[PDB]
Design a protein around this ligand. Structure first.
Ligand code: CLA
Ligand code: CLA
Ligand code: CLA
Ligand code: CLA
Ligand code: CLA
Ligand code: CLA
Ligand SMILES: CCCCCCCCCCCCCCCC(=O)OC[C@H](COP(=O)(O)OC[C@@H](O)CO)OC(=O)CCCCCCCCCCCCCCC
Ligand code: KC2
Ligand SMILES: CC1=C(C#C/C(C)=C/C=C/C(C)=C/C=C/C=C(C)/C=C/C=C(C)/C=C/[C@@]23O[C@]2(C)C[C@@H](O)CC3(C)C)C(C)(C)C[C@H](O)C1
Ligand SMILES: CC1=C(/C=C/C(C)=C/C=C/C(C)=C/C=C/C=C(C)/C=C/C=C(C)/C=C/C2=C(C)CCCC2(C)C)C(C)(C)CCC1
Ligand SMILES: CC1=C(/C=C/C(C)=C/C=C/C(C)=C/C=C/C=C(C)/C=C/C=C(C)/C=C/C2=C(C)CCCC2(C)C)C(C)(C)CCC1
Ligand SMILES: CC1=C(C/C=C(\C)CCC[C@H](C)CCC[C@H](C)CCCC(C)C)C(=O)c2ccccc2C1=O
Lengths: 143, 741, 219, 74, 155, 73
């Protein structure tokens, strides 16, 4: 048998159609991720990605941060998450400015308006996710 | 059939081609026109496949070169034995091993060097040795100097025989390629005939000469009163007196009542309390079992008779969905190309040297070698360095095979083709692994330094601030500690006391001790993994991208080692697989240097030392590894600065030679940087100015001087760098360990 | 000791002048490259032809002589610092005795006076010289990182960047984020410059710490 | 005192290297042999081979002998 | 027909003829259920075998009894296991919804040139799944009866 | 001003340290020079230079800084 064939029946493209690259599991999961999901607007793509990253970003600061052994450990973790998210959304905005200089199409991540909607979604979502993880970690004794 | 087929008188014996210097190569045979000719004569000396196209001739040259090398090695074994016979204190050490410093070299009084004949005990003045040959001979049972003298003479006879064999097998009766390509019979004879019979013979030697002599020495009999080996060999009554099972003869062997030999064939394990080393009965049983295993293994491959395997068929039968044709063509590759075989063999030899280094220190095999702290450190470090060098040689010869002997007609859609077809994925993923591993492993050290300097020990990656415990290593150590009862019931002790158990100590000094693993061990082990991974990255990229790359599609046409392909494409510098090896040698050097530093500090702080009558364990450095190895500042202070005292304060003492070599190796390491950083163009222009100065005086040579080639400059820089660094570590370790231990 | 170290200083000055004067005089042309002025001041090379033409541009003469400038100034400053530490401490018969051999410099100047620096912070605590210890190690690290750019040259890193470009372009999710400038390995003169930069900054950081902390800890 | 001496000696070395580098840039960029026909500056290029060879000689002598005496003492 | 579940000891084993006069949809549902049961039972049997004598997690002293261990596990761990399994099952449902869909192939084997070797290894998967299906039920039943784990029951 | 009274004993201060990464131990260690905050001990000789030149109070140094700022402007 042969589970490694040319990518899209093109032997001269620099890729291989391995199980990892071209399996139905990989295709399903990637195509269903928000950045690839069909029908999602750029705002919702950014929103889902933002909440996703903001929920987990608080944790390293909370437990491994300098004030882990302090009564305000989770507060400092949330503030650190907000700062890191501010840096990340600044990076997103400058990336959009540098890449999609001249664009008018919109409704597309590869355009200025679409990337701006995506960045707004990411920023709000990540702030909300950091706050939500703060709220859950305050009341973790519930579970 | 497998048969002997050789050509007679293939090459005449004459000094005419000794006189003709560059005869071996077509270009060099013309004669010199520049000084680069002189260097190329040495560079292409042993490149037989560039000299002659015939694989038969290449094989014959290689075979006789192997003979010459064995002659050199026999002369080296002879030097060891003869120096022990004559210019040594082996008898004094044999009488009193713990206090006597082993020494088998003496300097002559000429220019004040006579101080180097330091006080080594036993009424003998000489240079202390650290090779462990004294302990080797004690294990072998040598108790007199006549034995050392006569085995040295035998070694000289064998060296002469090997020179004769090398001459004969190239000038009088050279084999054919058909003879050389009998890989199946070669494997059969090397397994059963070389390894198997070697182990069987050594087991017999041990059982007959080493067990009785060593047991009597441990009992207390002085070497003078020990019965001689020839008496012991046939005196069955004495051997029955020592080991009662010998009175039963060989009938318990021929009948399968092998349990009768339990006394002198044991599975005791651990270390002998007297000598603080492995039990020689255990070693005899070990070698006997290995002899049986190798003789059993050597009857696998096909020969003149119908039974046996074909490695071609075995390889061709292994092909999977993700591998296409699988191992098809590899048998032909390894039968046709010597460089592929050299690559594999060098890789395994180097890994074996490293495994030897790891095994000997944890399980001291020779008597009174564990207490001989210089010997353990020297052997471990030496074998580590040899292993790294062999691994890089493996990578280099793999690249050479790729450049020269690779062919798609042969290796189409096999594992080699499939590996080349995703080399980019391989190297990119190894690059990510290297970045991740180095970032974590070194940034933990850097974090520790930062927090210590900021006065925040509570934020450290220490054993008491943020613990990174090697839970898996601790679990494996616990399993090995509990092994002798549950999973190895016939074993009476653990394989090595490093995992756990009692503190073996001979006299006051400590032979072996359990080695604890904590946060520092976690950090340094991940550092080791990072260094190994970067070395593998460099070497594997060199091997894979020897044919071509996205930068140079025709890299194979240029050759294996070439300077560049010009300043185009932004610069194509060191694109060659040779230059990849040149860079990987720096990285294995760094890897082995960190490994030996870890070994030295850990053994000095946690294992080596002394134990008093009550049990006051006092280590050489005082257990500072666990709390100081967490920072690079601690590595710089408590290991290099702290232990350099015994080197730098060595002037006016017997270790002053180590001090001089410390400085000289430093000098050579720095001298290497000239070649490593500089370039041929400047040097050729400087030589032009000097050549004008000479031509003004009518003495510019006919062989015009030239700056060294680019590849040669890189090679010279690498050689000087390695020599300087290795000599620095050599002098430092030897001076420190001889002074303190 | 002053005799010998002064002759060493003469060696340093003369060799730095040799490299620099040769670069200046051969910048226009040489027997290996008579038309160097056409290429200019700083170019990578002339190619592997004619035996190789590495570091031929007379900018590389400057880059080579920078190592010797650092070497000779280091010798000068070691001489100054050791003689003055001995004079200030009142034992000039340490310099007068030990400076005649090189192990005296390696032991009674570097090793002896490195203790208060490297003991800036240890397992038991920290002192006010911990910043000097950290900067000492910092300069060591930069000096070491310079060797990378000085030894390893562009072809290896270019091919490695081809591999990384392949990986970034082929992985999902991340390949939506795409560069504008094609990432390439550093040019030859650029990497010579970077390696020399890491060397020099390193030099100055290491000696600054060692010269400012050992003096403070010894007086 | 030590900080100031080290500082100013290092900057002196840098300034000297820069002076020579800009002399090289002048030679390769701004030097006009037609203007400097048989000049005091052109004669420097004329016997540059002698200059470089003798600087090589003195550097070699100094290094050989200083290193040798230091090793003798060592 | 068209599947790879047949074997030597029983041939094409269908005594009650469920597949007889059945649609390809029902056949695909049956094979998906078969492979899911086999895989889950492999995981179960391996989990009991390993955790009986080597259970370092959760303080290293949770009960070796399979039935008691899951009750001893914290609620959050059970919730996370359920979330993980559900996240695999949504992709199972999507693979079922796909136009090309073999029953248990998350790998998408149809796009590659497969052979009798692939068929034989699918048969290996299925046979091991059947054996593990019997094994897991046996282990749980013995755990309920005796209260010992698999290897302790063997002890 | 304190250094002027006792030049040979008081260690000159370069500037205050502002670092949130400092621990309590580093804070206590770097608190030196007869001040209540962490500081860096000057090794540039500017104190000696200005004292020799004629500066005796912080006001003179501040006015020098102001005038140099105007010069740069
Ligand atoms: C029992 C038979 C036998 C024995 C003992 C050996 C032993 C050896 N062979 Mg081998 N060899 C054998 C059969 C045997 N061969 C056969 C049947 C073939 C033909 C297929 C070959 C073909 C062959 C080749 C082509 C080469 C060897 C080489 C070697 C040496 C390997 C290096 C080493 O570790 O040396 C260990 C050395 C010793 C233990 C010292 C003993 C010295 C003599 C025997 C006394 C070693 C001496 C290599 C060589 O030339 O090395 C010199 C080599 O290149 N052999
Ligand atoms: C100390 C000296 C030094 C350093 C730092 C490096 C660094 C590196 N070498 Mg090596 N190298 C060296 C000497 C050194 N080399 C020398 C002398 C040579 C010549 C023989 C080479 C030759 C060489 C080759 C040929 C290759 C490497 C590779 C690498 C990389 C390994 C991946 C890694 O762990 O990166 C991680 C980075 C580090 C370990 C440095 C410290 C990182 C910590 C976390 C600090 C982080 C700081 C912060 C985030 C940023 C700055 C803060 C602020 C100022 C903004 C990396 C770039 C290999 C590679 O490409 O790997 C993929 C490779 O192929 N090196
Ligand atoms: C009066 C002083 C002076 C002046 C006016 C100039 C002016 C010039 N020099 Mg320079 N030069 C000087 C001193 C001076 N030099 C000295 C002292 C040296 C010896 C080191 C040199 C060596 C030198 C060379 C070898 C060359 C020049 C060249 C030039 C020209 C272009 C430089 C350029 O592009 O800069 C812009 C440069 C940059 C933006 C890079 C700056 C990088 C800095 C120095 C890094 C600092 C280190 C690090 C970041 C800090 C670490 C902090 C901690 C961690 C320009 C006419 C070039 C020329 O004429 O080419 C035809 C040229 O090749 N100079
Ligand atoms: C410790 C390191 C080191 C050493 C020893 C040297 C040595 C030399 N460099 Mg320098 N150099 C170095 C580092 C070093 N360099 C570095 C890092 C660089 C930056 C890339 C350079 C860049 C460089 C350039 C570009 C130039 C030099 C030149 C010189 C010469 C200077 C004069 C001299 O001392 O001659 C006397 C020589 C010595 C003191 C050492 C010679 C060897 C000793 C005495 C051993 C004698 C042989 C021995 C018995 C053999 C035994 C074999 C077994 C000499 C060959 C210049 C030159 O060639 O001028 C003529 C020159 O143009 N060097
Ligand atoms: C519940 C799991 C399950 C399922 C869904 C299937 C499904 C299938 N098997 Mg079967 N099979 C199973 C378990 C299962 N198998 C086990 C454990 C064995 C080992 C004995 C086999 C052995 C086996 C063979 C050898 C073959 C098949 C084949 C088939 C396929 C065609 C026959 C058919 O219509 O079966 C439909 C099956 C069902 C509708 C399941 C009904 C289950 C009843 C209700 C339970 C009976 C068990 C009883 C209550 C308890 C047993 C004792 C103990 C555990 C308590 C079909 C995909 C054939 C095939 O693939 O041909 C190409 C084939 O050759 N199977
Ligand atoms: C080399 C010239 C020189 C220098 C370097 C200084 C330096 C100084 N003088 Mg001044 N001074 C000078 C000439 C100079 N003086 C002369 C000729 C006189 C007349 C006798 C004085 C009289 C004088 C008095 C009376 C006082 C000073 C003071 C000072 C200090 C503060 C200066 C200031 O705030 O400037 C700020 C202004 C500028 C930076 C601009 C300068 C002018 C521009 C560049 C134009 C250049 C043309 C400083 C040490 C004060 C002090 O406290 O001394 C101890 C102070 O009270 N100076
Ligand atoms: C770490 C890297 C894992 C990913 C790359 C492995 C990819 C790989 O090498 O291809 C899969 C390959 C097995 O392929 P086949 O069974 O087709 O090949 C068997 C061969 O021996 C016959 O040529 O290796 C493994 O399964 C190793 C798995 C990682 C353990
Ligand atoms: C199905 C498989 C599975 C997956 C793929 C998976 C993935 C991840 C990831 C993402 C990669 C994170 C980030 C994460 C984190 C944590 N997992 Mg978790 N996990 C799985 C299974 C279990 C089980 C069975 C348990 C468990 C736990 C914890 C705790 C501890 C909390 C605590 O200290 O109380 C934390 C923080 C234990 C628990 O909740 O204990 C009350 C517990 O029993 N997980 N887990
Ligand atoms: C149904 C189905 C499938 C399925 C399935 C099944 C059955 C999946 C089962 C998965 C399973 C069972 C996965 C458990 C993981 C547990 C982990 C990682 C534990 C972490 C544990 C952690 C992080 C910590 C533990 C601690 O104790 C430590 C060490 C110290 C103590 O102080 C306390 C804490 C808590 C801190 C397929 C086959 C997949 C596909 C098919 O199509 C459909
Ligand atoms: C695949 C896989 C994996 C992975 C996984 C992962 C990666 C996971 C993750 C997970 C996660 C990561 C999760 C998450 C969650 C989240 C959440 C829970 C969130 C929430 C949010 C919110 C609630 C928000 C809100 C808001 C606000 C508040 C404000 C306004 C705005 C908004 C509305 C947004 C593993 C390897 C393991 C295994 C195998 C498979
Ligand atoms: C008074 C006195 C004296 C005297 C002195 C003298 C006389 C001195 C001199 C000195 C000198 C005499 C010095 C010099 C120096 C020099 C230098 C340092 C140089 C440099 C150079 C350069 C760098 C160059 C460059 C260039 C080029 C290359 C080209 C062209 C251009 C130019 C020029 C730019 C005495 C001591 C006796 C005593 C006391 C007093
Ligand atoms: C110093 C140096 C030289 C000049 C050094 C040479 C030619 C070596 C001299 C060896 C001879 C054989 C002298 C050995 C000692 C006895 C005098 C003979 C180069 O030619 C060169 C070329 C390419 C990269 C780097 C360098 C490089 O660093």
């Amino acid at each position: 048998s042969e589970f490694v064939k040319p990518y899209n029946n093109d032997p001269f493209v620099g890729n291989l159609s391995t199980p990892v690259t071209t399996s139905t599991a990989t295709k399903l999961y990637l195509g269903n991720l928000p950045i690839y999901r069909k029908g999602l607007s750029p705002l919702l793509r950014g929103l889902e990605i933002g909440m996703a990253h903001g929920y987990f970003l608080i944790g390293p600061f909370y437990i491994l941060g300098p004030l882990r052994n302090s009564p305000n450990a989770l507060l400092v973790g949330l503030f650190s998450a907000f700062g890191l998210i501010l840096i990340l959304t600044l990076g997103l905005t400058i990336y959009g400015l540098a890449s999609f200089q001249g664009t008018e199409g919109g409704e597309n991540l590869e355009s200025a308006k679409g990337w701006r909607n995506f960045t707004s979604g990411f920023s709000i979502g990540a702030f909300g996710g950091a706050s939500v993880a703060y709220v859950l970690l305050d009341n973790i004794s519930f579970f | 059939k497998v048969r002997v087929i050789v050509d007679k008188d293939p090459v005449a014996t004459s000094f005419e081609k000794w006189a003709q210097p560059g005869h071996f190569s077509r270009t060099l045979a013309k004669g010199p026109k520049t000084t680069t000719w002189i260097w190329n004569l040495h560079a292409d000396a042993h490149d037989f496949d560039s000299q002659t196209s015939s694989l038969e001739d290449i094989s014959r040259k290689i075979f006789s070169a192997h003979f010459g090398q064995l002659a050199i090695i026999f002369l080296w074994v002879s030097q060891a034995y003869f120096h022990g016979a004559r210019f040594s204190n082996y008898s004094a050490w044999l009488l009193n091993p713990t206090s006597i410093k082993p020494s088998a070299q003496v300097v002559w009084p000429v220019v004040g060097q006579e101080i180097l004949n330091g006080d080594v005990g036993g009424g003998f003045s000489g240079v202390q040795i650290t090779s462990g040959v004294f302990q080797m001979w004690r294990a072998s049972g040598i108790t007199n100097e006549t034995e050392l003298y006569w085995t040295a003479m035998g070694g000289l006879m064998m060296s002469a025989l090997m020179v004769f064999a090398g001459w004969f097998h190239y000038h009088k009766a050279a084999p054919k390629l058909e003879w050389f390509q009998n890989v199946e019979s070669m494997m059969n004879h090397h397994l059963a005939g070389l390894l198997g019979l070697g182990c069987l013979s050594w087991s017999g030697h041990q059982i007959h000469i080493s067990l009785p002599i060593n047991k009597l020495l441990d009992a207390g009999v002085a070497p003078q009163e020990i019965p001689l080996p020839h008496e012991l060999l046939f005196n069955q009554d004495l051997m029955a007196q020592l080991y009662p099972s010998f009175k039963k003869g060989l009938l318990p062997f021929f009948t399968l009542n092998w349990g009768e030999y339990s006394d002198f064939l044991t599975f005791k394990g651990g270390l002998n309390p007297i000598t603080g080393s492995l039990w020689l009965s255990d070693t005899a049983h070990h070698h006997l079992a290995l002899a049986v295993l190798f003789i059993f293994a050597g009857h696998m491959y096909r020969t003149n008779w119908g039974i046996g395997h074909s490695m071609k068929e075995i390889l061709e039968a292994h092909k999977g969905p993700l591998t296409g044709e699988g191992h098809k063509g590899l048998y032909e590759i390894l039968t046709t190309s010597w460089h592929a075989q050299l690559a594999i063999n060098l890789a395994m030899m180097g890994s074996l040297s490293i495994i030897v280094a790891h095994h000997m220190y944890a399980m001291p095999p020779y008597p009174y070698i564990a207490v001989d702290y210089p010997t353990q450190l020297s052997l471990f470090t030496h074998h580590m360095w040899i292993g790294g060098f062999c691994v890089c040689g493996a990578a280099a010869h793999g690249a050479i095979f790729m450049v020269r002997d690779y062919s798609p007609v042969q290796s189409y859609n096999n594992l080699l083709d499939r590996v080349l077809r995703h080399r980019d994925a391989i190297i990119s993923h190894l690059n990510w692994v290297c970045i991740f591993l180095g970032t974590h492993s070194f940034g933990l050290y850097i974090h520790n330094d930062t927090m210590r300097a900021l006065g925040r020990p509570q934020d450290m990656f220490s054993d008491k601030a943020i613990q990174l415990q090697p839970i898996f290593a601790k679990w494996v150590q616990s399993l090995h500690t509990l092994a002798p009862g549950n999973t190895a019931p016939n074993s009476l002790a653990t394989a090595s006391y490093a995992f756990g158990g009692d503190v073996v100590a001979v006299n006051g000094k400590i032979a072996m001790m359990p080695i604890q693993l904590g946060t520092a061990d976690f950090l340094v082990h991940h550092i080791h993994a990072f260094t190994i991974h970067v070395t593998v990255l460099i070497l594997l990229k060199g091997v894979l991208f020897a044919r071509s790359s996205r930068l140079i599609p025709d890299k194979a046409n240029l050759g294996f080692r070439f300077p560049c392909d010009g300043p185009g494409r932004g610069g194509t510098c060191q694109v060659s697989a040779w230059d990849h090896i040149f860079l990987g040698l720096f990285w294995m050097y760094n890897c082995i240097s960190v490994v030996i530093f870890h070994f030295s500090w850990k053994m000095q702080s946690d294992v080596w030392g002394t134990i008093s009558e009550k049990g006051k364990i006092t280590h050489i450095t005082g257990g500072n590894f666990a709390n100081s190895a967490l920072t690079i500042n601690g590595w710089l202070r408590d290991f290099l600065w702290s232990q350099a005292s015994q080197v730098i304060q060595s002037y006016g003492s017997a270790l002053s030679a180590y001090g001089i070599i410390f400085l000289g190796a430093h000098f050579i390491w720095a001298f290497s940087l000239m070649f490593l950083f500089s370039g041929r163009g400047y040097w050729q222009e400087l030589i032009e100015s000097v050549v004008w100065a000479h031509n003004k005086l009518k003495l510019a040579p006919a062989i015009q001087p030239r700056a060294l080639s680019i590849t040669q400059g890189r090679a010279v820089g690498l050689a000087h760098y390695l020599l300087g660094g290795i000599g620095t570590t050599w002098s430092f370790f030897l001076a420190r360990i001889i002074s303190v231990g | 000791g002053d005799f010998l170290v002064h002759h060493a200083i003469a060696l340093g000055l003369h060799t730095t002048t040799l490299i620099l004067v040769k670069g200046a005089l051969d910048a226009r042309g040489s027997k290996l490259m008579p038309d160097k002025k056409d290429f200019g001041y700083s170019f990578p090379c002339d190619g592997p032809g004619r035996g190789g033409t590495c570091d031929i541009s007379a900018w590389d003469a400057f880059y080579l002589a920078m190592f010797w400038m650092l070497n000779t100034i280091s010798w000068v400053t070691f001489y100054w610092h050791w003689k003055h530490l001995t004079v200030w401490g009142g034992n000039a018969a340490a310099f007068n005795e030990s400076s005649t051999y090189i192990m005296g410099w390696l032991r009674d100047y570097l090793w002896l006076n490195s203790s208060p620096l490297i003991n800036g912070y240890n397992a038991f605590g920290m002192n006010a010289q911990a910043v000097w210890a950290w900067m000492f190690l910092f300069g060591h690290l930069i000096w070491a990182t310079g060797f990378m750019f000085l030894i390893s040259w562009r072809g290896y890193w270019q091919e490695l960047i081809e591999t990384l470009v392949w990986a970034h372009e082929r992985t999902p999710i991340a390949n939506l984020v795409k560069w504008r400038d094609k990432p390439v390995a550093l040019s030859i003169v650029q990497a010579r410059l970077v390696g020399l930069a890491h060397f020099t900054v390193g030099f100055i950081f290491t000696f600054a710490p060692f010269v400012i902390a050992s003096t403070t800890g010894k007086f | 005192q030590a900080a100031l001496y080290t500082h100013h000696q290092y900057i002196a070395g840098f300034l000297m290297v820069g002076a020579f580098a800009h002399g090289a840039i002048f030679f390769v960029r701004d030097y006009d042999p037609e203007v400097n026909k048989d000049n005091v500056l052109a004669r420097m290029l004329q016997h540059k081979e002698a200059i470089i060879s003798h600087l090589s000689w003195v550097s070699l002598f100094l290094g050989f002998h200083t290193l040798g005496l230091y090793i003798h003492n060592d | 027909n068209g599947m790879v579940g047949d074997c030597k000891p029983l041939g094409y084993f269908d005594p009650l003829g469920f597949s007889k006069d059945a649609s390809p949809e029902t056949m695909a549902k049956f094979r998906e259920a078969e492979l899911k049961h086999g895989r889950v039972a492999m995981l179960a049997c391996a989990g009991m075998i390993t955790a009986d004598k080597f259970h370092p997690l959760f303080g290293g002293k949770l009960s070796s009894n399979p039935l008691l261990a899951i009750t001893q596990v914290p609620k959050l761990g059970l919730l996370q296991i359920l979330l993980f399994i559900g996240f695999m099952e949504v992709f199972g449902i999507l693979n079922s919804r796909r136009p090309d869909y073999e029953p248990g192939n998350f790998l998408g084997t149809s796009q590659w040139e497969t052979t009798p070797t692939w068929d034989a290894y699918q048969l290996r998967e299925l046979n091991n799944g059947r054996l593990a299906m019997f094994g897991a039920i046996g282990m749980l039943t013995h755990a309920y009866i005796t209260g010992k784990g698999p290897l302790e029951l063997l002890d | 001003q304190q250094w002027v009274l006792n030049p040979l004993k008081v260690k000159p201060i370069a500037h205050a340290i502002w670092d949130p990464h400092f621990g309590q131990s580093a804070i206590k260690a770097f608190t030196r020079g007869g001040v209540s905050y962490p500081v860096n001990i000057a090794t540039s000789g500017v104190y000696h230079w200005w004292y020799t030149v004629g500066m005796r109070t912080n006001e003179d140094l501040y006015f020098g800084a102001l005038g140099l700022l105007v010069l740069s402007t």
